Amino acid sequence: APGSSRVELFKRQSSKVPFEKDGKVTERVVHSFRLPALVNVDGVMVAIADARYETSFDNSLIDTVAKYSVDDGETWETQIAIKNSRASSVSRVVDPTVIVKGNKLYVLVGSYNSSRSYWTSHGDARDWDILLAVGEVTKSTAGGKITASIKWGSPVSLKEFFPAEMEGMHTNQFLGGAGVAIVASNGNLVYPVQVTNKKKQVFSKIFYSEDEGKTWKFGKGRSAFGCSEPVALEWEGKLIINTRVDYRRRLVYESSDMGNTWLEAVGTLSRVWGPSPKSNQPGSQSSFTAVTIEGMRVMLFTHPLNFKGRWLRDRLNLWLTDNQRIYNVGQVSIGDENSAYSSVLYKDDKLYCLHEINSNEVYSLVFARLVGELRIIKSVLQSWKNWDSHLSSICTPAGCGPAVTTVGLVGFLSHSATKTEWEDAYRCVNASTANAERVPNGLKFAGVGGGALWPVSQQGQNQRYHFANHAFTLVASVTIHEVPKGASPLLGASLDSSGGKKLLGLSYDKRHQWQPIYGSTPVTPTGSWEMGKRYHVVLTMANKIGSVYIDGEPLEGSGQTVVPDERTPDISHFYVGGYKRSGMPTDSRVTVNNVLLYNRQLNAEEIRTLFLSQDLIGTEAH
Ligand SMILES: OC[C@H]1O[C@@H](O[C@H]2[C@H](O)[C@@H](O)[C@H](O)O[C@@H]2CO)[C@H](O)[C@@H](O)[C@H]1O
């Protein structure tokens, strides 16, 4: 990332902290630093973490360290925010989870006295407490300089707020999800927490306070079992709770009622992010925040790619999303270093990341100035803004008719293309092409193997288009140049690598009829088409039903089940203008322009507007 730089701020086996025991304080070298949380309190940067004094092993001696800086991270002061009980050589305060409100740092930690096993394996709660400490940040301008100070109060146990029973089950322990939590728009302090029951299942809840931390409540709902280390933000009046699932894809939920109800975010972010290339390795803590960049509300998300496997968790990656498009900003860590946990802060229009580096299970936290990354982010955000503005600004055929909708518009294939790719105007997922000739606002295809392939599950580890398994609208303009020998494809969602098994699609045949394909149902040819005429094609799928529209009108027989109510589809890719498979004997001679993908089923007016504005939406002229 050109322009970016970093320092080893919390340096393993080197950085010292003020270790207090029985009224005596000694500057003490720390073996490992883990669990970064990086925040802004009134212009003061504060970096909170675990100081694992003797080893990186989880069940060992740990205090919560804080560093703070008034100069954007050039210099820092160092404190212990929270000390462990000092009961034993493995006493520890763990998983520090931070909320900023006003001048206050709320830090929630589990506290353990003597156990040498990880908390989820405990059969009881005898070794556990849950503590809240408050740090009060003040600033001084005495002497013509800015000086900050943080006064940490004594921790208070919140155990009294943990019910012995929850929706049936009996509770054992809970911890914060680590990293940075939030103040909701209603002022509530909101911690996503990870909780165990007596069956040793782990699940996520919302733990919240309506009275500045004095009392706490749990929402009655929960994630699925197996969801740990939850991280949350508030988006459009809802909490978005992004969870770690060891050995599986991350589950993401939305709750509008402080955790009383949880709905999997299948239409947006759930199941997008895999913990390793084959999504069969441990997960991670993640930074997940909502921020406003160049006037646009967006979300930033970090997770390692974990090519190495196990808990090594190399290749920390950064992602940008507006809850519609999902852009890979790139790799924050360096080379193949192990770099699991992280915390991203956007402050005074500068981007920073405090994150782990691990060699031989000795961990430092580096403090990175993400200059290259913010440059890419602003570029991408300007492209999103530009194209949304382009589409929204179009005076559609009436005065002007209804505006073309950009709500839920995820991808758009128009004029830009290279020799082997059709480029997404939204810059997230290009389509691969074969036997494609560039024409205004699209591509012309010919010959066996021709077409374009827009990957869905084929995206691999990180599946930005997973939403399509639940609902989508796929729109294009198509022109047929040659009468085919038999039924030939134009547009569709494939369930397998070849395109032979379809969820929903549209073909055309030698008798000048359309052949809409509804899942595995026998195909009934219908309607009529003419060579050389530009047709508007809309495929919609929602609530397991698929519809095919030509020139804004449903084909006779549209609105059929395409998904057996038991299973959830796993779309491989969308195919456009052919299958893009030389193993498929069809030869589609067609031009396709302006392909739009939405994460929802468009309504009647929206479809009609798109049909009527086909000649106006191309990116060529702009
Ligand atoms: O490697 C650091 C990492 O260890 C994880 O714990 C693993 C451990 O790595 C593995 O050797 C052992 O067999 O199983 C453990 C989990 O039961 C921790 O989860 C993680 O926090 C790190 O401490």
Residue 395: count other Cβ atoms within 10 Å of its Cβ: 11
- The verdict on the CB of residue 229 being under 6 Å from ligand 1 is no
> Residue 174 and residue 228: Cα distance in Å, rounded?
10
Q: From atom 9 of ligand 1, which residue's Cα is the shortest distance away?
A: 311
- Cα torsion at 453, 264, 94, 13 (round to 10°)? 10
> Residue 385 and residue 593: Cα distance in Å, rounded?
22
Note whether 18 and 108 are same-domain residues.
yes
User: Cα–Cα distances in Å, from 197 out to 70, 114, 172, 231, 242?
Assistant: 43, 21, 5, 20, 21
Note whether 293 and 376 are same-domain residues.
no
Output the domain CATH number for residue 53. 2.120.10.10
> Residue 97 and residue 106: Cα distance in Å, rounded?
8
User: Cα–Cα distances in Å, from 282 out to 192, 335, 344?
Assistant: 20, 21, 21
Q: What is the resolution of this structure in A?
A: 1.6
Question: HEC string of 117-133?
Answer: CCHHHCCCCCCEEEEEE
Q: Which residues have CB under 8 Å from 431's CB, separation 6+? A: 413, 421, 422, 424, 452, 453, 454, 455, 574, 576, 595
Cβ-contact 411, 464 below 8 angstroms: no
Note whether 384 and 298 are same-domain residues.
no
The H or E element that residue 386 is part of is: helix 371-393
- The dihedral sign for the CA sequence 339, 343, 344, 348: negative
Note whether 405 and 538 are same-domain residues.
yes
> Residue 81 and residue 501: Cα distance in Å, rounded?
58
Note whether 553 and 426 are same-domain residues.
yes
- The verdict on the CB of residue 311 being under 6 Å from ligand 1 is yes
Give bridge partners of residue 593 from the DSSP assignment. 442, 477
Cβ-contact 338, 357 below 8 angstroms: yes
Q: Which residues have CB under 8 Å from 141's CB, separation 6+? A: 147
By DSSP bridging, strand 409-417 and strand 590-598 are antiparallel
> Residue 415 and residue 441: Cα distance in Å, rounded?
4
Task: Among 369, 396, 417, give the residue marking a domain's end.
Answer: 369
Note whether 48 and 121 are same-domain residues.
yes
Note whether 326 and 418 are same-domain residues.
no
Note whether 23 and 126 are same-domain residues.
yes
Of all atoms in ligand 1, which is nearest to the CA of residue 56?
23
Supply φ then ψ for residue 557, to 5 degrees: 90, 10
Q: Ramachandran region of residue 580, left (φ > 0), alpha (ψ -120 to 50) or beta?
A: left
Note whether 286 and 391 are same-domain residues.
no
The two three-digit tokens of residue 224, written as one number: 């699925």
User: Cα–Cα distances in Å, from 50 out to 46, 82, 277, 460?
Assistant: 14, 10, 29, 34
> Residue 493 and residue 537: Cα distance in Å, rounded?
13
> Residue 618 and residue 440: Cα distance in Å, rounded?
8
Note whether 537 and 401 are same-domain residues.
yes
Supply φ then ψ for residue 474, to 5 degrees: -120, 125
CA of 311 to the centre of ligand 1 (A): 7
Domain count along the chain: 2
Closest CA to 33 of 48, 18, 43: 48
What 142-148 contacts at long range (C-beta under 8 Å, 24+ apart), as own/partner pairs, is: 146/70, 147/70, 148/44, 148/68, 148/70, 148/77
Residue among 116, 311, 356, 358 whose CB has most ligand 1 atoms within 8 A, to mutate: 311
> Residue 233 and residue 210: Cα distance in Å, rounded?
17
Give bridge partners of residue 354 from the DSSP assignment. 343, 367
The H or E element that residue 389 is part of is: helix 371-393
Residue type, 251: L
Q: From atom 21 of ligand 1, which residue's Cα is the shortest distance away?
A: 58
Task: Among 316, 345, 369, give the residue marking a domain's end.
Answer: 369
- Cα torsion at 455, 460, 461, 462 (round to 10°)? 0
The H or E element that residue 111 is part of is: strand 104-112
Supply φ then ψ for residue 523, to 5 degrees: -90, 130
Note whether 233 and 334 are same-domain residues.
yes
The two three-digit tokens of residue 141, written as one number: 């301008």
For residue 612, the SS3 value is helix
- The verdict on the CB of residue 424 being under 6 Å from ligand 1 is no
Residue-by-residue DSSP string for 344-382: EEEETTEEEEEEEEEETTEEEEEEEE-HHHHHHHHHHHH
Residue 531: count other Cβ atoms within 10 Å of its Cβ: 11
Question: Between vectors from CA 309 to CA 15 and to CA 195, what angle results, nearest 5°?
Answer: 75
Domain span at residue 96? Answer: 1-369
Task: Among 369, 384, 412, give the residue marking a domain's end.
Answer: 369
CA of 310 to the centre of ligand 1 (A): 8
CA of 342 to the centre of ligand 1 (A): 18
Note whether 148 and 275 are same-domain residues.
yes
Q: From atom 2 of ligand 1, which residue's Cα is the shortest distance away?
A: 311
